[PDB]
Amino acid sequence: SEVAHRFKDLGEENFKALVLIAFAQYLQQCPFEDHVKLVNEVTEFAKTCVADESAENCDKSLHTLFGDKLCTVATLRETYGEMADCCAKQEPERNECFLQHKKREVDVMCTAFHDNTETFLKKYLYEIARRHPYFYAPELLFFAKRYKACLLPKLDELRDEGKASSAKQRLKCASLQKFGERAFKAWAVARLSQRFPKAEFAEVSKLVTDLTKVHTECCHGDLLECADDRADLAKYICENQDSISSKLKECCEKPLLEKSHCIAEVENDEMPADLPSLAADFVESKDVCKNYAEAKDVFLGMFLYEYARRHPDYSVVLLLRLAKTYETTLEKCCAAADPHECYAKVFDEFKPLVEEPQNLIKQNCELFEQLGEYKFQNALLVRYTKKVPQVSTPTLVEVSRNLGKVGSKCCKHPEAKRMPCAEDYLSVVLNQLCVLHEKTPVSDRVTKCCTESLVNRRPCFSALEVDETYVPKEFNAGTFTFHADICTLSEKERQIKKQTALVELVKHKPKATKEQLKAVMDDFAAFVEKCCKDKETCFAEEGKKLVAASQAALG
Amino acid sequence: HMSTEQIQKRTAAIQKRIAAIQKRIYAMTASGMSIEEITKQIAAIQLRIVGDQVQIAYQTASGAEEIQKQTAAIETQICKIEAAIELKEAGITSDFYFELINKAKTCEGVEALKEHILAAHT
């Protein structure tokens, strides 16, 4: 009955794609041919459920029904990894376990897409859902519809665009389990409020409430409920767009799968003119403590609503630190003899909180606007390697060039829009580093930062200093002497090889000067013109001459 | 000037809800600030009901501007009222949250903010 309820709402094609995505997101092991028969049988069973709601065992939950077909093939433990052990349990324990198991020619593809339109389209989502178990299911349906619409720069754009949404949804699903529902709803109030400053608190709280149900369902593998609901909140915003935003007019003309994607990406609405100070009803009011005591979370959510609608220049995390500090003082102050006099200067405590990221953005953008993406990425690779030298040389290069790439697509924008762009990118790379470090732990400080509240995840990383517990391991065993293999290819693409030479030189001589390290990197870039203009013969002469210069520092 | 059988059902649908509100408010008066204004909104929404019931009569007398903007804001006004009763019943004695409910533009957000105040109170 619940399966027939979802089959009727979602499209016939969209139902199929969703059950195929949900199967590949869990039993990623079974190849396309195994999963497609199960998807077909589930749609064929739901087809009967549409007609007779009581007959054929149409009464079971989507987790028992779509979790028994996922288990029929998943019988043996060898024809899957340690994930087949989940199968032994019964719902809701069964799906509780499946969650716990997180872990290529322009005219060649068209020869297979022309014969079977369905065989090519379903193949896009099968391995894209098996390669990204936490990708937003309704977004993946739109991603494939976009793919169905020259074929080299368009697919590269959709590869990079799809890489951003997958990473974004990993962060969303992570804050939900790791930091709670209230924490997600708190982010929701803030980012929605900046986006829709015209909307009254009740409409925002409606969006917060409906959006949490969407993302909670999507993370819990309730991928068919998620897409059905993401479409309903999208309809609601479009039906009541005056009560929400102005920007939504064009987004709502677009068809079903696009309509939702557009609203999500919608521009910040021109915040209502001449809004009063939050100080009046949050610091001055006689009933601040009485209203806070009444519905503590709603009063704080209202604080965030007003602060966020007025600060589209702040980060969502900054708005959360300001909400958290206000909550913290309200908690202590309401107990005091004169709560009013206690909290009367609360807003003056927000000053260092908003200064700290603005000062960091301005200090780092001053370096970016004077060094470029190469000499700024190089500078970040020296500082971030001295900070945490326990990171693997190529993983530290990747996160150094990735964190530098933030300054590139952030400093262009003015002081008014630098912070929300900087936080958006930085959060995404920090979660990609924390996901990579959780699997292979190398540093106890990185663990502390990733484990800390999502709010102060970036503040933690910025506080790090040079790890005084690192003994300069001066190898010089091929790491300090680069190979002349990339000399023959010769390209600015192989900049990672030149960068990895720097991160090994920092790790082997850590107490090196800021000018000393720039002189050893400038002499290394000059030595490349020997191997760019006796092929391997230049590497032996440059290896002996560059190592002679490094003897003047001897780290 | 359309759906006169569905307008009889539409009007009768609001009447059942106003009766539901009136019982819960008459009980409340010996069981929270909106209480005097709730009784004014009830009387004002009844004027719209009389207007509809007169429109039916006018069409029957005549040979026969389809305004749904009054109907929608009526349903949302009924929600702003019903929500304020669920909050008064919940023990919310705080004119901040009442205004937040009354400031809402949609009955959908009226209930979402209601449920939010309700859980936050516990």
Side-chain angles (χ1 to χ4, degrees), chain A residues 1 3-6 9-11 13-15 17 19 21-24 30-31 34 36 38-40 43 45-46 48-51 55 58 61-64 67-68 71 73-74 81 83-84 86-88 90-92 94-95 97 99 101 106 109-110 112 114 120 124-129 132-135 137-139 141-142 144 148-149 153 155-157 162 164-167 169 171 173-174 176 179-197 199-222 225-229 231-232 234 236-238 240-247 251-252 255 258 260-264 268-269 271-273 275-277 279-285 287-289 291-295 297-323 325-331 333-337 339-340 342-344 346-348 350 352-354 356-357 359-361 364-365 367-368 370-374 376 378-379 382-385 387-389 394-395 397 402 404 407-408 411 414 416 419-422 424 427 429-431 433-434 437 441-443 445-450 452-453 455-456 458-466 468-470 472 475 477-478 484 488-490 499-506 510 512 514 516 519 525-526 540 543 548-549 552-553 555, chain B residues 2 4-6 11-15 17-22 24-25 27-28 30 32-35 38-39 41-47 49-65 67 71-74 76-87 89-92 94 96-98 100-102 104 106-110 112-122:
Chain A
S1 184
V3 49
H5 185 275
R6 307 317 194 290
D9 307 334
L10 298 164
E13 175 191 38
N14 293 329
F15 178 97
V19 235
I21 279 176
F23 276 153
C30 284
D34 298 32
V36 296
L38 306 159
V39 167
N40 296 16
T43 61
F45 163 58
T48 62
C49 300
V50 159
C58 308
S61 62
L62 279 181
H63 280 140
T64 55
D68 283 5
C71 205
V73 199
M83 197 190 296
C86 297
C87 250
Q90 195 153 308
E91 303 287 5
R94 211 267 89 143
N95 203 50
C97 190
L99 292 178
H101 279 294
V106 186
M109 295 284 175
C110 309
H114 96 294
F120 197 79
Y124 176 112
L125 43 99
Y126 146 65
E127 220 75 273
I128 231 295
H132 298 272
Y134 298 146
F135 191 24
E139 192 68 11
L141 310 185
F142 155 78
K148 271 229 303 176
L155 194 129
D156 299 338
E157 186 267 305
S165 181
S166 71
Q169 186 64 28
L171 164 123
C173 286
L176 232 156
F179 312 102
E181 178 160 301
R182 189 219 197 209
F184 182 118
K185 271 146 59 184
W187 172 290
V189 159
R191 190 52 225 186
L192 275 165
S193 203
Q194 294 192 123
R195 204 185 302 276
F196 312 137
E200 291 302 345
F201 185 64
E203 276 77 68
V204 175
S205 85
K206 167 61 162 39
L207 301 188
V208 169
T209 247
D210 282 358
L211 238 151
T212 294
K213 190 192 192 268
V214 173
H215 286 36
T216 303
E217 278 168 350
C218 253
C219 309
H220 287 37
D222 318 333
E225 293 118 294
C226 171
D228 190 13
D229 292 358
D232 290 354
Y236 167 74
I237 128 92
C238 292
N240 277 270
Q241 27 185 247
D242 321 61
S243 315
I244 316 292
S245 166
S246 56
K247 279 70 219 167
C251 291
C252 304
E258 286 168 52
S260 313
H261 178 76
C262 190
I263 294 165
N268 288 354
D269 195 25
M271 42 158 283
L275 293 151
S277 190
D281 36 306
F282 291 102
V283 183
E284 275 156 26
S285 177
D287 299 18
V288 173
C289 277
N291 292 332
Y292 177 52
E294 270 270 15
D297 283 22
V298 168
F299 186 81
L300 287 171
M302 254 303 293
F303 172 81
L304 241 178
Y305 162 72
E306 303 268 32
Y307 218 107
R309 75 196 287 223
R310 297 153 161 75
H311 294 273
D313 62 304
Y314 285 9
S315 325
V316 170
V317 296
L318 167 55
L319 292 156
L320 299 166
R321 324 213 190 89
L322 304 179
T325 42
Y326 177 72
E327 169 190 50
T328 277
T329 79
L330 256 189
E331 274 300 330
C333 284
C334 294
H340 190 356
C342 175
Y343 56 68
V346 55
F347 281 43
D348 310 330
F350 303 163
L353 282 171
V354 312
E356 185 255 316
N359 284 344
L360 180 129
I361 279 161
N364 274 327
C365 280
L367 308 180
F368 178 66
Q370 79 170 93
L371 307 176
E373 205 177 20
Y374 169 81
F376 181 66
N378 281 29
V382 161
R383 99 151 62 124
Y384 258 89
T385 273
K387 275 189 191 184
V388 48
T395 82
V397 154
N402 251 10
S408 322
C411 307
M419 213 197 305
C421 162
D424 204 331
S427 84
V429 291
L430 290 170
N431 215 314
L433 167 136
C434 287
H437 178 263
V442 289
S443 177
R445 319 176 73 195
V446 173
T447 287
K448 187 243 183 190
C449 289
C450 311
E452 220 79 5
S453 181
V455 192
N456 78 308
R458 205 240 75 242
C460 184
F461 272 113
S462 279
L464 302 189
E465 294 145 312
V466 176
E468 11 64 79
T469 60
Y470 176 58
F475 279 71
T488 51
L489 303 156
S490 270
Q499 274 179 332
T500 41
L502 176 88
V503 308
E504 297 291 41
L505 201 54
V506 173
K514 250 134 204 291
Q516 278 191 322
Chain B
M2 199 273 317
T4 178
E5 211 252 84
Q6 322 293 284
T11 292
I14 292 167
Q15 297 269 49
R17 274 164 110 186
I18 301 188
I21 287 163
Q22 291 176 142
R24 315 216 297 160
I25 63 104
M28 231 227 71
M33 188 224 69
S34 212
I35 313 312
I38 291 298
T39 28
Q41 293 152 327
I42 287 298
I45 293 175
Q46 272 152 3
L47 258 54
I49 296 167
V50 175
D52 299 359
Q53 300 195 172
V54 162
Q55 186 55 231
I56 303 167
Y58 171 56
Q59 286 157 12
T60 306
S62 77
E65 180 68 341
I67 300 299
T71 84
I74 283 303
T76 83
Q77 202 49 237
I78 305 164
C79 310
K80 299 185 213 133
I81 293 173
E82 270 149 353
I85 304 162
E86 277 197 43
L87 307 180
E89 280 162 3
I92 310 277
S94 182
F96 171 88
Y97 304 106
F98 285 102
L100 254 45
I101 286 295
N102 295 301
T106 186
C107 176
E108 284 98 293
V110 163
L113 176 64
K114 173 197 66 121
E115 287 303 340
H116 273 196
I117 312 159
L118 292 176
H121 188 257
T122 74

Short mmCIF file of all heavy atoms in Angstrom, two decimals, chain A residues 195-196 234-235 237-239 241 245-268, unseen atoms left out:
data_model
loop_
_atom_site.label_atom_id
_atom_site.label_comp_id
_atom_site.label_asym_id
_atom_site.label_seq_id
_atom_site.Cartn_x
_atom_site.Cartn_y
_atom_site.Cartn_z
N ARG A 195 18.62 33.36 2.33
CA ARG A 195 18.09 33.18 1.02
C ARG A 195 16.74 33.85 0.86
O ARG A 195 16.51 34.51 -0.14
CB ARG A 195 17.99 31.69 0.69
CG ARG A 195 18.00 31.43 -0.81
CD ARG A 195 17.79 29.98 -1.17
NE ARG A 195 18.79 29.09 -0.59
CZ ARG A 195 19.99 28.85 -1.12
NH1 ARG A 195 20.35 29.44 -2.25
NH2 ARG A 195 20.83 28.01 -0.52
N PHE A 196 15.84 33.70 1.83
CA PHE A 196 14.49 34.26 1.74
C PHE A 196 14.22 35.27 2.86
O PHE A 196 13.37 35.02 3.73
CB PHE A 196 13.43 33.13 1.75
CG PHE A 196 13.71 32.00 0.81
CD1 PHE A 196 13.52 30.69 1.20
CD2 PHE A 196 14.14 32.23 -0.48
CE1 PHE A 196 13.76 29.64 0.32
CE2 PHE A 196 14.41 31.19 -1.35
CZ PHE A 196 14.21 29.90 -0.94
N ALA A 234 8.96 21.91 -3.14
CA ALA A 234 9.22 22.71 -4.32
C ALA A 234 7.93 23.27 -4.87
O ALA A 234 7.92 24.43 -5.28
CB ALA A 234 9.93 21.90 -5.36
N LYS A 235 6.84 22.47 -4.86
CA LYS A 235 5.52 22.92 -5.31
C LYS A 235 5.06 24.02 -4.37
O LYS A 235 4.90 25.14 -4.80
CB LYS A 235 4.50 21.77 -5.38
N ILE A 237 6.67 26.11 -2.41
CA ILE A 237 7.35 27.41 -2.55
C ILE A 237 6.85 28.10 -3.81
O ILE A 237 6.58 29.29 -3.77
CB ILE A 237 8.93 27.45 -2.39
CG1 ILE A 237 9.68 28.16 -3.57
CG2 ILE A 237 9.54 26.11 -2.12
CD1 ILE A 237 9.96 29.72 -3.40
N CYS A 238 6.67 27.36 -4.88
CA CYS A 238 6.21 27.92 -6.13
C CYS A 238 4.77 28.39 -6.12
O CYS A 238 4.45 29.38 -6.76
CB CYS A 238 6.48 26.92 -7.24
SG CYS A 238 8.25 26.70 -7.54
N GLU A 239 3.93 27.72 -5.34
CA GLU A 239 2.54 28.12 -5.23
C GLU A 239 2.41 29.40 -4.37
O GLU A 239 1.60 30.27 -4.68
CB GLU A 239 1.69 26.96 -4.69
N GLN A 241 4.96 31.81 -3.79
CA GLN A 241 6.24 32.51 -3.98
C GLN A 241 6.29 33.96 -3.47
O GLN A 241 7.38 34.44 -3.16
CB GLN A 241 6.75 32.43 -5.42
CG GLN A 241 5.67 32.26 -6.46
CD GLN A 241 6.30 32.07 -7.81
OE1 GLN A 241 6.18 32.92 -8.70
NE2 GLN A 241 6.98 30.95 -7.97
N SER A 245 9.85 34.38 -1.66
CA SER A 245 10.88 35.12 -2.40
C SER A 245 10.35 35.69 -3.74
O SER A 245 9.24 35.37 -4.17
CB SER A 245 12.06 34.17 -2.66
OG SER A 245 13.00 34.63 -3.62
N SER A 246 11.15 36.53 -4.38
CA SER A 246 10.83 37.10 -5.68
C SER A 246 11.50 36.25 -6.77
O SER A 246 10.89 35.92 -7.79
CB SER A 246 11.36 38.53 -5.75
OG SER A 246 12.75 38.56 -5.48
N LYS A 247 12.77 35.90 -6.53
CA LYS A 247 13.65 35.14 -7.39
C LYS A 247 13.03 33.84 -7.95
O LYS A 247 13.37 33.41 -9.06
CB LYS A 247 14.99 34.86 -6.66
CG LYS A 247 16.00 36.02 -6.67
CD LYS A 247 15.59 37.24 -5.82
CE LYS A 247 15.95 38.56 -6.48
NZ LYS A 247 15.30 39.72 -5.82
N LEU A 248 12.10 33.23 -7.21
CA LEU A 248 11.47 31.96 -7.57
C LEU A 248 10.56 31.95 -8.83
O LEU A 248 10.24 30.87 -9.33
CB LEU A 248 10.68 31.44 -6.37
N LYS A 249 10.17 33.12 -9.36
CA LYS A 249 9.29 33.18 -10.54
C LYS A 249 9.72 32.30 -11.71
O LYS A 249 8.93 31.49 -12.18
CB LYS A 249 9.09 34.63 -11.01
N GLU A 250 10.97 32.43 -12.17
CA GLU A 250 11.45 31.65 -13.30
C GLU A 250 11.70 30.20 -12.96
O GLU A 250 11.38 29.32 -13.76
CB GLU A 250 12.68 32.30 -13.96
N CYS A 251 12.21 29.92 -11.75
CA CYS A 251 12.46 28.54 -11.28
C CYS A 251 11.20 27.69 -11.34
O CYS A 251 11.26 26.48 -11.58
CB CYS A 251 13.03 28.54 -9.87
SG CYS A 251 14.71 29.19 -9.74
N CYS A 252 10.07 28.31 -11.07
CA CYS A 252 8.80 27.62 -11.00
C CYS A 252 8.14 27.38 -12.35
O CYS A 252 7.17 26.64 -12.41
CB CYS A 252 7.89 28.34 -10.03
SG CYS A 252 8.62 28.51 -8.38
N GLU A 253 8.66 27.99 -13.43
CA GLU A 253 8.14 27.72 -14.76
C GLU A 253 8.71 26.36 -15.22
O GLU A 253 7.97 25.55 -15.78
CB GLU A 253 8.55 28.85 -15.72
N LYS A 254 10.01 26.09 -14.91
CA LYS A 254 10.76 24.86 -15.21
C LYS A 254 10.02 23.55 -14.86
O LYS A 254 9.18 23.54 -13.96
CB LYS A 254 12.15 24.92 -14.52
N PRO A 255 10.32 22.42 -15.55
CA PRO A 255 9.62 21.16 -15.23
C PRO A 255 10.15 20.43 -14.01
O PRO A 255 11.33 20.49 -13.72
CB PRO A 255 9.81 20.33 -16.49
CG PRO A 255 11.14 20.76 -17.00
CD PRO A 255 11.27 22.23 -16.66
N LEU A 256 9.25 19.73 -13.31
CA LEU A 256 9.41 18.95 -12.08
C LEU A 256 10.84 18.74 -11.55
O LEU A 256 11.13 19.22 -10.46
CB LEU A 256 8.71 17.60 -12.24
N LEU A 257 11.72 18.00 -12.27
CA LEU A 257 13.07 17.72 -11.77
C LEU A 257 13.97 18.95 -11.75
O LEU A 257 14.81 19.10 -10.85
CB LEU A 257 13.71 16.56 -12.54
N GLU A 258 13.78 19.86 -12.70
CA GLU A 258 14.52 21.10 -12.79
C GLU A 258 14.00 22.10 -11.77
O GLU A 258 14.82 22.67 -11.05
CB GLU A 258 14.44 21.70 -14.19
CG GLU A 258 15.28 20.95 -15.19
CD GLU A 258 14.97 21.38 -16.60
OE1 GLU A 258 14.99 22.60 -16.87
OE2 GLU A 258 14.68 20.49 -17.45
N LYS A 259 12.65 22.28 -11.68
CA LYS A 259 11.99 23.22 -10.75
C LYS A 259 12.59 23.17 -9.34
O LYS A 259 12.92 24.21 -8.79
CB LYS A 259 10.46 23.01 -10.69
N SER A 260 12.83 21.95 -8.81
CA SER A 260 13.42 21.75 -7.49
C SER A 260 14.88 22.21 -7.44
O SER A 260 15.26 22.94 -6.53
CB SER A 260 13.31 20.28 -7.08
OG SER A 260 12.01 19.77 -7.30
N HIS A 261 15.69 21.80 -8.43
CA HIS A 261 17.11 22.16 -8.53
C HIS A 261 17.30 23.67 -8.61
O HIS A 261 18.22 24.20 -7.98
CB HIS A 261 17.76 21.48 -9.74
CG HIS A 261 19.20 21.83 -9.94
ND1 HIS A 261 20.20 21.28 -9.14
CD2 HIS A 261 19.78 22.66 -10.84
CE1 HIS A 261 21.34 21.80 -9.57
NE2 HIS A 261 21.14 22.64 -10.59
N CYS A 262 16.44 24.37 -9.37
CA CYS A 262 16.51 25.82 -9.52
C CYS A 262 16.30 26.54 -8.20
O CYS A 262 17.09 27.42 -7.87
CB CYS A 262 15.55 26.32 -10.58
SG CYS A 262 15.79 28.06 -11.03
N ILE A 263 15.21 26.20 -7.47
CA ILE A 263 14.85 26.80 -6.18
C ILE A 263 15.98 26.64 -5.17
O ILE A 263 16.28 27.57 -4.42
CB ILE A 263 13.53 26.18 -5.68
CG1 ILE A 263 12.36 26.55 -6.59
CG2 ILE A 263 13.23 26.60 -4.25
CD1 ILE A 263 11.18 25.71 -6.35
N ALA A 264 16.62 25.48 -5.17
CA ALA A 264 17.74 25.20 -4.29
C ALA A 264 18.91 26.15 -4.58
O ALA A 264 19.58 26.62 -3.66
CB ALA A 264 18.19 23.76 -4.49
N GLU A 265 19.16 26.45 -5.88
CA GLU A 265 20.24 27.33 -6.30
C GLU A 265 19.86 28.82 -6.35
O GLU A 265 20.73 29.67 -6.52
CB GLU A 265 20.80 26.87 -7.65
N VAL A 266 18.56 29.15 -6.16
CA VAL A 266 17.98 30.49 -6.23
C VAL A 266 18.82 31.54 -5.51
O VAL A 266 19.51 31.26 -4.54
CB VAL A 266 16.51 30.52 -5.77
N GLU A 267 18.79 32.75 -6.05
CA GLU A 267 19.55 33.87 -5.52
C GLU A 267 18.93 34.41 -4.25
O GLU A 267 17.71 34.33 -4.06
CB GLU A 267 19.60 35.01 -6.56
N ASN A 268 19.77 35.03 -3.40
CA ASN A 268 19.28 35.66 -2.18
C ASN A 268 18.34 36.80 -2.53
O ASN A 268 18.63 37.59 -3.43
CB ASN A 268 20.44 36.14 -1.29
CG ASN A 268 21.19 35.01 -0.64
OD1 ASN A 268 20.82 33.84 -0.72
ND2 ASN A 268 22.28 35.34 0.03
#
